[PDB]
């Protein structure tokens, strides 16, 4: 099946999704560190974790988020 | 008056060349104490002078430092850098929140800060940003704390207990109010000793510290540090 | 095969620290060895440190 970008993530705490919005994408201007969730994505196996995470030893501030959607696929709120 | 008893130096003149440049004269000194005292005071003043500095900023529409505001002529990072150079004097407490609200075309100087009574702006003409369009307004909440030395943003954020919301910008704090020190030892005339010296300390600050108070604080720090050697177990 | 792409840009500030490589325009490269305190650096008659 098709994987999707969603807010919730299995087997994680609530503090992990604090930076993520309702669309599963980290807030612009949110300070992040190594291991933090950036884009919440899961893949059906019910689902397995495939979300993008900040590489270890990498920090900074999110300053830009770009969303590219194929024609026909619905666009989320951030797009 | 003898070999065993030393002449105690004391302050004799405070020449305020400008609001920042100042001269402090100490005399008399006994054949080499001038150089030692001047070097010790210069080393203490350049590193252990308490002062007030801007720590956190919060603009109305700005959400991170790498963005821009509609109307301002400079970047948000530039605004933070200019705010870093703001010199204020705080009496009563070590924590103050100031509010700035400006509108219309023109510079936004430190004189636009809302009057607080216990906070004095040494440089009221210090510019911050430039509003280049009508109907464009800037609203800022500046956070100022008292401290010592240079504390970067990472050192303060290492606690991470506050977890500041998006839009609260951290700026490196240079709490030191003394920017330049130069000591000079020359001959001093005291009745008939003919071998005493006077020490003149020229200090350039940001205007938020009294030169006499700075000298007194440096002497107090030196005495407090040296009392341990005085005791010596 | 792909139906969506999301790119996130992270901006960080790198400050000078020992081990960083600095050079002039005449090939005089080197690495920072120590960040000396302001009061420890040599100063002239006017009191301005280098």
UniProtKB/Swiss-Prot annotation, chain B:
Residues 160-163 are annotated as: Required for interaction with Crp at class II promoters. Residues 1-233 are annotated as: Alpha N-terminal domain (alpha-NTD). GO terms for molecular function: DNA binding; DNA-directed RNA polymerase activity; protein dimerization activity. GO terms for cellular component: cytoplasm; cytosol; cytosolic DNA-directed RNA polymerase complex; membrane; transcription elongation factor complex. Its EC number is 2.7.7.6. It catalyses: RNA(n) + a ribonucleoside 5'-triphosphate = RNA(n+1) + diphosphate. One of its GO terms (biological process) is bacterial-type flagellum-dependent cell motility. Keywords: Acetylation, ADP-ribosylation, DNA-directed RNA polymerase, Nucleotidyltransferase, Transcription, Transferase. (Microbial infection) ADP-ribosylated on both alpha subunits by the phage T4 protein ModA. ADP-ribosylated on only one of the alpha subunits by the phage T4 protein Alt. The N-terminal domain is essential for RNAP assembly and basal transcription, whereas the C-terminal domain is involved in interaction with transcriptional regulators (such as CRP) and with upstream promoter elements. Homodimer. The RNAP catalytic core consists of 2 alpha, 1 beta, 1 beta' and 1 omega subunit. When a sigma factor is associated with the core the holoenzyme is formed, which can initiate transcription. Both the N- and C-terminus interact with different regions of transcriptional regulator CRP. The rRNA transcription and antitermination complex (rrnTAC) consists of RNAP, NusA, NusB, NusE (rpsJ), NusG, SubB, ribosomal protein S4, DNA and precursor rRNA; S4 is more flexible than other subunits. DNA-dependent RNA polymerase (RNAP) catalyzes the transcription of DNA into RNA using the four ribonucleoside triphosphates as substrates. This subunit plays an important role in subunit assembly since its dimerization is the first step in the sequential assembly of subunits to form the holoenzyme. Part of the processive rRNA transcription and antitermination complex (rrnTAC). The complex forms an RNA-chaperone ring around the RNA exit tunnel of RNAP. It supports rapid transcription and antitermination of rRNA operons, cotranscriptional rRNA folding, and annealing of distal rRNA regions to allow correct ribosome biogenesis. Belongs to the RNA polymerase alpha chain family. This is DNA-directed RNA polymerase subunit alpha. It comes from Escherichia coli (strain K12). The lineage of its organism: Bacteria, Pseudomonadati, Pseudomonadota, Gammaproteobacteria, Enterobacterales. The chain holds residues 3 to 235 of 329 of the full protein.
Swiss-Prot record, chain C:
It comes from the Bacteria. The gene is rpoB. Belongs to the RNA polymerase beta chain family. Acetylated on several lysine residues in the presence of glucose. DNA-dependent RNA polymerase (RNAP) catalyzes the transcription of DNA into RNA using the four ribonucleoside triphosphates as substrates. The RNAP catalytic core consists of 2 alpha, 1 beta, 1 beta' and 1 omega subunit. When a sigma factor is associated with the core the holoenzyme is formed, which can initiate transcription. The rRNA transcription and antitermination complex (rrnTAC) consists of RNAP, NusA, NusB, NusE (rpsJ), NusG, SubB, ribosomal protein S4, DNA and precursor rRNA; S4 is more flexible than other subunits. In pull-down experiments interacts with CedA. Co-administration of salinamide and rifampicin or salinamide and myxopyronin suppresses the emergence of resistance to both antibiotics. This is DNA-directed RNA polymerase subunit beta.
